[PDB]
Homo-oligomer: 60 residues x 2
Amino acid sequence: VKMTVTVGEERRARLRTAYTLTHLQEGHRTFSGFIAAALDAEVQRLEQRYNEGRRFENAE
Amino acid sequence: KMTVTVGEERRARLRTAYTLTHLQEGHRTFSGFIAAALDAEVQRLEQRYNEGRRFENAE
C-alpha cells in the first residue's frame, strides 16, 4: 500500500519554500494540506478537460 | 526527504488520472506527471506572490 509520491530532494525543498512564503495567503494550515490541495486541483483539472467533469473510475 | 505524503486514495486517483491522460498531457512517466503538476503550482504561486521570480528562503 503506497501513500506517498516521489518528488525528489530538490523539488521537495522548493515546495517547502513555496509553502512557507505563501501558505498564510493561500489559507493552507499545513504542508500536508498544501500538497493535497495542489494534487487534487490537478486531478480535477484533468476531469474537466478529458472526462466531461466527471470523476475518473479507478481500475478494478 | 524525497517524497510527499498523499494517502492511499489520493495516490490511486493520481495514478488513474495519469493512466488516462498522460499521452496528450505530454508525460512519459508517473513521476514526470507528479513533478509537472507540483512545478506548475510553484510557478502559479511565484506569479501571484513573487512577481514571477523564484522563491528564496528567509535568511
